[PDB]
Amino acid sequence: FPGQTQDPLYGYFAAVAGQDGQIDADELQRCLTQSGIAGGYKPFNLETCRLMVSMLDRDMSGTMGFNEFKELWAVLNGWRQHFISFDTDRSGTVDPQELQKALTTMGFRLSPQAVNSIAKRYSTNGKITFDDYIACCVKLRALTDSFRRRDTAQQGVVNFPYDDFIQCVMSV
Amino acid sequence: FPGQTQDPLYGYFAAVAGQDGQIDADELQRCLTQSGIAGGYKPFNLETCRLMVSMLDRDMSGTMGFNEFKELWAVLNGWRQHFISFDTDRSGTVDPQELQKALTTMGFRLSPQAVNSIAKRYSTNGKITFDDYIACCVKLRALTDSFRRRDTAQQGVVNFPYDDFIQCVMSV
Ligand SMILES: [Mg+2]
Ligand SMILES: [Mg+2]
Ligand SMILES: [Mg+2]
Ligand SMILES: [Mg+2]
Ligand SMILES: [Mg+2]
Ligand SMILES: [Mg+2]
Ligand SMILES: [Mg+2]
Fold it and tell me: Which of these CATH numbers, 1.10.238.10, 3.20.20.30, 3.40.640.10, 1.10.260.40, describes A1-172?
């Protein structure tokens, strides 16, 4: 009984959720905007929301419930902290070098080539929005889990048949 | 030089290109819309255009020049025609079984399982839109190029170190 309280995140979710207690990507975009997790920056774009839904969609419903929303909140905060470290000018954007450190402090060791190829895919006039940073974190997590589960020899090299490579990457 | 003419695509490009002769995804979105490549279908959204830029970004600039735009136009025409052979009444969508026959007619060599996962990734109410079909085609061709390049022995298997895998899959 004692030590219970109203979850402060519940309100944002109930404002957008259907009577079934579920939200889809569009509904997720709205309540994330409301939640202030993107701060003063722009809303997450709809591809970023699709990625976030897919990340937590364990019943393959195309939707999430409130418990998953709270899980998502925890994940997004972890990643946001690394971002606001190196968002030294409060831009809501990081440059490629800043990005490299954020991902580094998260424990990704990526080469300058891997970072540059991430930056160029999501740059907007040479800088990466918080929105695109989050999309990138979601994809990195999924593709890294895909790589790791196939590393039989445990030397950081995976033997990828073509068909498996395609399904694996196209599924994200 | 006889047979020289003004290239009819140059105008669409020159209207949005910077003085450097380059376009980013936003600009490409605009000039593909003007160009009429969609026919009666809806315009491509930004994310599909980012994929397009990435498919032809041989110098990792995050932009495209006019010659690459010219290539892109040819490629899209070919894909649009296959799409239309399965969307006779121009609804703007195609279903999963038709997507499979499209990809095989296209030259993509994919297991029924792989095609299934691709159809599920791009379904919305059991239907694949035109924008999502093109996004799929772009992504398949880019990832298949990256794979082919690492498989000059043509064994259909590539040994991918983690950093190269990431560089490669995050760029598209
Ligand atoms: Mg679900
Ligand atoms: Mg900054
Ligand atoms: Mg002419
Ligand atoms: Mg721009
Ligand atoms: Mg035209
Ligand atoms: Mg380029
Ligand atoms: Mg039909």
Answer: 1.10.238.10
